[PDB]
Amino acid sequence: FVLPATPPQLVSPRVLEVDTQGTVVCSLDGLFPVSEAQVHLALGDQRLNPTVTYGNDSFSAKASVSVTAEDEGTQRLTCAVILGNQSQETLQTVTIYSFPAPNVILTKPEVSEGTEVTVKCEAGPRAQLLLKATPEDNGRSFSCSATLEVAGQLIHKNQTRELRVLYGPRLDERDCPGNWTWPENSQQTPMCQAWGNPLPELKCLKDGTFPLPIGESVTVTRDLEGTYLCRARSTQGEVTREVTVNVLSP
Numbered sequence: 001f002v003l004p005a006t007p008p009q010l011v012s013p014r015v016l017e018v019d020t021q022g023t024v025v026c027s028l029d030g031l032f033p034v035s036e037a038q039v040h041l042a043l044g045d046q047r048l049n050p051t052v053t054y055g056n057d058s059f060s061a062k063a064s065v066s067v068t069a070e071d072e073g074t075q076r077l078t079c080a081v082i083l084g085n086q087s088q089e090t091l092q093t094v095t096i097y098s099f100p101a102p103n104v105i106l107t108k109p110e111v112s113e114g115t116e117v118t119v120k121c122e123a124g125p126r127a128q129l130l131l132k133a134t135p136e137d138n139g140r141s142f143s144c145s146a147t148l149e150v151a152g153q154l155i156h157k158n159q160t161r162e163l164r165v166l167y168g169p170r171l172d173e174r175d176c177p178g179n180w181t182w183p184e185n186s187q188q189t190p191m192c193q194a195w196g197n198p199l200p201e202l203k204c205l206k207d208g209t210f211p212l213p214i215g216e217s218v219t220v221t222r223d224l225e226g227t228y229l230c231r232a233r234s235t236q237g238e239v240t241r242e243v244t245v246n247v248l249s250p
């Protein structure tokens with residue numbers, strides 16, 4: 001056999017978090033018979049199970065490693081290639097750290113338009129973010145970002161959380177006009193839109209059953225004429241508006 005006196009190439013992250021998985025790769029060439037060599041990979045007191053891949057008088061051993069709280073601190077990663085009574089070994093360090101997630105603390109996750117909202121992180125003066133919730137905030141996300149120093153390397157970790165804002169049903173004269181005057185047989189598009197979260201259910205009825213074709217283009221007919229009661233209700237309340245359609249002679 002032939003096992004040159006040089007350490008195997010060892011690739012691994014110099015840093016690894018608790019309860020996460022890592023990947024080590026050891027390789028070496030110029031040895032023979034590679035198929036008979038024993039590859040010893042291990043981090044600390046944990047012996048790894050590598051997947052050895054052979055090549056032109058060479059090999060590459062890949063292995064995954066999982067760490068826990070007990071392994072916290074500096075651990076030793078080793079790769080040893082053995083043939084006969086000779087062995088080539090490489091020593092490296094891997095630091096296991098614990099970085100608690102910076103949780104986003106929302107006073108109240110779901111709130112109604114107008115309420116005061118406070119945002120703080122929890123994992124020198126204490127800072128919080130205050131803002132008066134607006135409807136434009138429904139679905140928006142607040143974040144808590146943090147950094148940690150481990151082995152001269154800067155690790156980043158964050159957390160985002162969405163805020164649900166609720167805004168009562170609304171029917172401004174602007175987005176749902178109180179009256180219409182259309183010439184019989186003209187083309188129009190009845191306009192009446194409710195506003196709110198949750199999205200309010202809208203119904204514009206005349207004589208309690210005849211609906212106004214809102215949002216769509218229609219041909220004005222005699223039977224559109226009348227008074228409609230547009231109701232927009234949701235768990236946040238209910239708003240009623242009366243709409244009058246006049247249908248002039250063509």
Ligand SMILES: *[C@@H]1O[C@H](CO)[C@@H](O)[C@H](O)[C@H]1NC(C)=O
Pocket residue numbers: 055056057
């Ligand atoms: C061994 O090396 C020679 C030179 O590249 C090549 O002809 C042969 O295919 C190689 N076998 C491998 C890649 O294992």
Ligand SMILES: *[C@@H]1O[C@H](CO)[C@@H](O)[C@H](O)[C@H]1NC(C)=O
Pocket residue numbers: 143144145157158159
């Ligand atoms: C938080 O980290 C994620 C990676 O999971 C990244 O995509 C995002 O930009 C970060 N958010 C911020 C800017 O706090």
Ligand SMILES: *[C@H]1O[C@H](CO)[C@@H](O)[C@H](O)[C@H]1NC(C)=O
Pocket residue numbers: 084085086
């Ligand atoms: C290695 O050492 C063992 C133990 O004495 C010996 O029996 C074996 O022949 C040696 N093989 C070599 C030269 O690597």
